[PDB]
Each structure stands twice: as structure tokens, then as C-alpha cells.
């Protein structure tokens, strides 16, 4: 099944080699194309050539790559153009073992399916306490009623604990309940100058101690915290003290944009404009998917199908570039003007 995708990929990547008409192909390539195009035209009944020139020939080939790309993604776009009609049989074409596929294409898919199907530790994108409703002013004292040590958020990745002279206490519970981290990396500091309830400046004397699971940790040094150990703070000083603890970064088993090599750049290439024809196409395609039809998903997908679809599309995009196909699309009206960043901006609804 991945094989089909690998093949589909190879083909497009190969058609992408046709820049001019004068050029001599890499023997290996010609081999692939010939076989593919044959067995394709054989079940499709289209007139694709190994060396296109006219335009209609180029379109024909692009349509082929399209058919394959869609078939490989398991996508039925429906009636989106009067010129192109998706031929379903294209799936069976890709199923033909006689059709080869590059080592690159093979490894690419194997990587996709590889990670997609399992999990792994990844540096999360945003601040720890990003999904918080209430935040407090940084450096300002705050002690909740009946408490000797009161911790609170002051930023997306920031917290600060207010300690009464001689006071101590566990803080960890402020972190817990949110996300599902595996390792939170810390670095605590002493708020040397902070505002008092009234507004007057106060000093935090040197001597405060932050310990994890019992062991004493230094300030300004990174700390490997499992999120379960005892996050204990102690104020042996004869004055109020305020300390800021920073979650520099944490790791969870949630998929990031680094699940697959340069996925980001690909996504950009997919979501890029080029022209109305491409745009509307790329859009109409993602309509069948769980992916945003024209704006980069906030959250990185986590299912094979998504990732895959993107990769194929990104490639099909490059194919578009080299082939320069020209055809209609329902609901798309091309503006011949030279094209500017302005005309593009507009196209994005």
C-alpha cells in the first residue's frame, strides 16, 4: 500500500525532470516513465507521451500525476474541472508491481508510515502555561489567604513564588494537570527587586533554596524535571522572598513540525500561491481532507494520510511549476496581469 504511494511519488518526481525539450534524460528515468506511461495510458486510455511539447501533452501528463497523487492519497475530488476528469483506475495502475520506485521514494514513505504509526518525545512549540486564563504581574508580590508560600503564573512560560520570611512549600501542583509532559526543563532565579502589595520596592536576600525530589538545585542552571518529583522551595532568610521559575522547554509525545524532515518547507510550498489555477486546485483538493484548504494548520497533523497527502501535493506542486499546465476550474477566474504580492494576498479569501 505504501508501495503504491512510493511509486506515485517516483513518477511525479520523474516528470519533474522534463525542463526543456533538448535535454537528454538519465537512462534510469526514461525507463521508469516509459513503463509507467504505458501501463497508465493502457488502463486510462489517455495520450501521454514520454517527451511532451505541445501543451495539451503537458496537461495530459500533469493530469496523470494528478490522478496518481490523488489515488495515492485516497482522494476523490469530484467534478472540479471541465478539462480534467479524475480516472479512478489510476489506483490499479500504481498497484502494478512492474512499475518501479526509487530508493529515495521508498525510504521517504517508510519514514512517513514509520513515525506516523508510533509516538516519540518532541520539543513542544509553545510556552508551557499558554492555555491559561489568568496571569499575574511579574515581580509583584502576592500571597493568597492563609498561605506562607504562594506560587502563580506571570507569563506563558513563567511562574513566580511569593515566600514569607522563614516559609517553605511544595509548588509542583501548579504545573500538573496541564498537557502531559515527560520532561520539563527548568531554570529558577531570585527576583532581587520586586513590588510589595503597596508598591514599595523589596529585596530577596541570598540564601533561598529550590530543591527537586529532595536534592538542592542551583539558580540559573537548567534542570531536568520529570514533573512528578517534589518541587520544594525554602526561605531561610529573615525577609520576604520572591523567585521566578522558568519552563525553558518541555517534551511530550505530541507531534511537532519535526516529525518528518523539513515538513515545514513542504507545507509552505503546498500553501504557496503560484497562480489562481494552482491555488484553486490545491484548495479544492484539501477540501476532501481534514487539512485547511488555504492556511497552514496551527497544529501539526498526526495521521499518515495527512502527512502523505502534503508530501504528494508539495511534489505535485513542483510538477505544476515545470509543466506550466493551463486549464479551467469551476469557480476559478484567472487574471492575466503579471501577478504581484497584492493579487496573491487577495486570492486567500
Partner 1 sequence: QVYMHRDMLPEPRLDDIERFRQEGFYYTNMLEAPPEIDRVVQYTYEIARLQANMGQFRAALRRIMDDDDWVRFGGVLRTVRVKFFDARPPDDILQGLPFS
- Binders of a copy of itself in range 110-169 (CB under 8 A): 110-111, 113-115, 117-123, 126, 130-142, 152, 156
Closest distance to partner 1 from the beta carbon of 324 (Å): 14
Instruction: Pick what 54 binds: partner 1, a copy of itself, none; C-beta below 5 to 8 Å, kind-dependent.
Output: partner 1
b/e 196-218 (16+ beta carbons within 10 angstroms → b)? eeeeeebebeeebbbebeeeebe
β-strands 231-234, 168-170 pairing: antiparallel
Rule CB under 8 A: which of 37-96 touch a copy of itself? none
Cα Rg of the chain (Å, integer): 29
Residue 213 C-beta-side C-alpha neighbours within 13 Å: 7
Q: What residue has cell string 479512478?
A: 88
Closest distance to partner 1 from the beta carbon of 172 (Å): 49
d(CA 139, CA 233): 17
How many residues line the site for partner 1 (CB under 8 A)? 13
In the bound state with partner 1, the residue whose beta carbon lies nearer, of 57 and 239, is 57
Burial (CB < 10 A; 0-12, 13-18, 19+), residue 271, is buried
Closest distance to partner 1 from the beta carbon of 90 (Å): 19
In the bound state with a copy of itself, the residue whose beta carbon lies nearer, of 116 and 309, is 116
Instruction: Pick what 51 binds: partner 1, a copy of itself, none; C-beta below 5 to 8 Å, kind-dependent.
Output: partner 1
Among 88, 197, 215, 230, indicate the residue that binds a copy of itself (CB under 8 A).
Answer: 197
| 163 bridge partner residues | 149, 241
Closest distance to a copy of itself from the beta carbon of 79 (Å): 27
In the bound state with a copy of itself, the residue whose beta carbon lies nearer, of 26 and 78, is 26
Instruction: Pick what 238 binds: a copy of itself, partner 1, none; C-beta below 5 to 8 Å, kind-dependent.
Output: none
Rule CB under 8 A: which of 3-62 touch partner 1? 21-22, 24, 34, 37, 47, 49-51, 53-54, 56-57
d(CA 159, CA 57): 63
Site string for a copy of itself, 290-329 (x = CB under 8 A): -----xx-x----------------x-xx--xx-------
Instruction: Pick what 98 binds: partner 1, a copy of itself, none; C-beta below 5 to 8 Å, kind-dependent.
Output: a copy of itself
Binding flag, residue 335, a copy of itself (CB under 8 A): no
Closest distance to a copy of itself from the beta carbon of 35 (Å): 9
DSSP assignment letter at 306: H
Measure Cα distances from 314 to 37, 189, 321 in Å: 21, 46, 11
Closest among 42, 28, 33 to 7, alpha carbons compared: 33
Degrees to nearest 5, angle at CA 325 with 320 and 326: 140
138 within 8 A of 160, measured Cβ to Cβ: yes
In the bound state with partner 1, the residue whose beta carbon lies nearer, of 83 and 192, is 83
Amino acid at each position: 500500500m505504501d508501495t503504491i504511494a512510493a511509486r506515485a511519488l517516483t513518477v511525479m518526481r520523474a516528470c519533474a525532470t522534463l525542463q526543456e525539450a533538448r535535454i537528454v534524460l538519465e537512462a534510469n528515468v526514461m525507463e521508469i516513465l516509459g513503463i509507467a506511461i504505458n501501463r497508465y495510458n493502457g488502463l486510462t486510455l489517455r495520450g501521454v507521451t514520454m517527451r511532451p511539447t505541445s501543451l495539451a501533452q503537458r496537461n495530459e501528463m500533469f493530469f496523470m500525476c494528478l490522478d496518481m497523487m490523488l489515488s495515492a492519497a485516497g482522494i476523490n475530488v469530484g467534478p472540479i474541472s471541465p478539462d480534467y476528469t479524475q480516472h479512478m483506475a489510476t489506483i490499479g495502475v500504481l498497484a502494478t508491481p512492474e512499475i518501479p520506485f526509487t530508493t529515495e521514494a521508498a525510504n521517504e514513505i517508510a519514514r512517513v508510515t514509520g513515525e506516523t504509526s508510533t509516538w516519540g518525545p518532541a520539543r513542544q512549540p509553545y510556552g508551557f502555561f499558554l492555555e491559561t486564563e489568568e496571569t499575574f504581574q511579574p515581580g509583584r508580590w502576592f500571597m493568597r489567604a492563609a498561605q506562607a508560600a504562594t506560587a502563580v503564573v506571570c507569563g506563558p512560560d513563567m511562574i513566580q513564588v511569593s515566600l514569607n520570611a522563614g516559609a517553605r512549600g511544595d509548588v509542583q501542583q501548579i504545573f500538573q494537570g496541564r498537557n502531559d509532559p515527560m520532561m520539563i526543563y527548568l531554570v529558577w532565579r531570585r527576583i532581587e527587586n520586586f513590588a510589595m502589595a503597596q508598591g514599595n520596592s523589596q529585596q530577596t536576600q541570598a540564601g533561598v533554596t529550590v530543591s527537586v525530589g529532595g536534592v538542592d538545585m542551583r539558580a540559573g542552571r537548567i534542570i531536568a524535571w520529570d514533573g512528578q518529583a517534589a518541587l520544594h522551595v525554602r526561605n531561610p532568610t529573615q525577609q520576604n522572598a520572591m523567585v521566578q521559575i522558568q519552563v525553558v522547554f518541555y517534551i511530550s509525545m505530541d507531534k511537532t513540525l519535526n516529525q518528518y524532515p523539513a515538513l515545514t518547507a513542504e507545507i509552505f510550498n503546498v500553501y504557496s500561491f503560484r497562480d489562481h489555477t494552482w491555488h484553486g486546485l490545491r484548495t479544492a483538493i484539501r477540501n476532501r481532507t481534514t487539512l485547511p484548504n488555504m492556511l497552514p494548520p496551527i497544529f501539526p497533523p498526526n495521521d499518515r494520510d495527512s502527512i502523505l497527502t502534503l508530501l504528494l501535493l508539495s511534489t505535485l506542486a513542483d510538477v505544476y511549476t515545470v509543466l506550466r499546465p493551463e486549464f479551467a476550474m469551476h469557480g476559478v477566474n484567472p487574471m492575466p496581469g503579471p501577478l504581484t504580492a497584492a493579487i496573491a494576498r487577495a486570492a486567500y479569501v
